[PDB]
Amino acid sequence: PQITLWKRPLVTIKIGGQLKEALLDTGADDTVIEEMSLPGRWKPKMIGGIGGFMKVRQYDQIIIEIAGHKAIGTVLVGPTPVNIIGRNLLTQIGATLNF
Amino acid sequence: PQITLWKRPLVTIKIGGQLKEALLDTGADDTVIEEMSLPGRWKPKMIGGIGGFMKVRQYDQIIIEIAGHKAIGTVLVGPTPVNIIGRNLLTQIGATLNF
Ligand SMILES: COc1ccc(S(=O)(=O)N(CC(C)C)C[C@@H](O)[C@H](Cc2ccccc2)NC(=O)O[C@H]2CO[C@H]3O[C@@H]4OCC[C@@H]4[C@H]32)cc1
Ligand SMILES: [Cl-]
Ligand SMILES: [Cl-]
Ligand SMILES: [Cl-]
Ligand SMILES: [Cl-]
Ligand SMILES: [Cl-]
Ligand code: NA
Numbered sequence: 001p002q003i004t005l006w007k008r009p010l011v012t013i014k015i016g017g018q019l020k021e022a023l024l025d026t027g028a029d030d031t032v033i034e035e036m037s038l039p040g041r042w043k044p045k046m047i048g049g050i051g052g053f054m055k056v057r058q059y060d061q062i063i064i065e066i067a068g069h070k071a072i073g074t075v076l077v078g079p080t081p082v083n084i085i086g087r088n089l090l091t092q093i094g095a096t097l098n099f
Numbered sequence: 100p101q102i103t104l105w106k107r108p109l110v111t112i113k114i115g116g117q118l119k120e121a122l123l124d125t126g127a128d129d130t131v132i133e134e135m136s137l138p139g140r141w142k143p144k145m146i147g148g149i150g151g152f153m154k155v156r157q158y159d160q161i162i163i164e165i166a167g168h169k170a171i172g173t174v175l176v177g178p179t180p181v182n183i184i185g186r187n188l189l190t191q192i193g194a195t196l197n198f
Contacts, residue, residue: 049149
């Protein structure tokens with residue numbers, strides 16, 4: 001698809017068997033999802049943002065569908081105000097910016 | 100152009116007679132620029148994201164040149180860790196997300 005930006009670029013994702021809404025966010029290096037349970041071990045990460053920093057849980061090699069496209073990669077979990085699909089997974093679904 | 104997302108999608112902008120580097124950011128409703136003077140009236144605003152909120156000055160009807168493409172809109176000025184071109188101006192240069 002070709003997604004214009006008059007509204008927020010929200011899509012459905014599927015992660016841990018669950019459907020969620022998320023933003024497709026070219027200004028995000030990484031993918032950040034609201035508190036949820038994921039399998040396996042996690043590693044610490046601090047991320048930056050507008051407002052300051054946030055600690056998250058880093059889970060690697062997580063299966064995630066984004067707008068019907070399959071990705072497998074790193075998901076940061078924490079108390080984010082919005083679920084964000086960052087460049088680590090936007091590249092896996094073949095997304096580009098065009099003008 | 101077509102801009103891939105392997106790296107941050109940074110472009111040169113011209114604002115207030117100054118050249119700056121800025122991130123093309125589909126996850127940002129608003130354009131947010133590091134502290135600078137702009138002409139005309141402003142009003143305070145609070146904007147929110149990964150780490151809470153940041154206070155900014157809202158300037159309306161500001162012309163910008165984004166990678167060669169002129170647009171006009173609202174610009175928020177404050178201590179942003181990164182200069183960000185948000186959807187309010189991305190729409191005006193015809194930017195879309197494609198996959
Ligand atoms: C109303 O209008 C607004 C309101 C909010 C924002 S925002 O900057 O808070 N943001 C909203 C989004 C969280 C829903 C836009 C994002 O694209 C920011 C834009 C952003 C970039 C850098 C710093 C501050 C903000 N990215 C961001 O927070 O990314 C996080 C996740 O990945 C990491 O990559 C980034 O680069 C490393 C740190 C951040 C980390 C912008 C305009
Ligand atoms: Cl980015
Ligand atoms: Cl990844
Ligand atoms: Cl957005
Ligand atoms: Cl505007
Ligand atoms: Cl359009
Ligand atoms: Na003005």
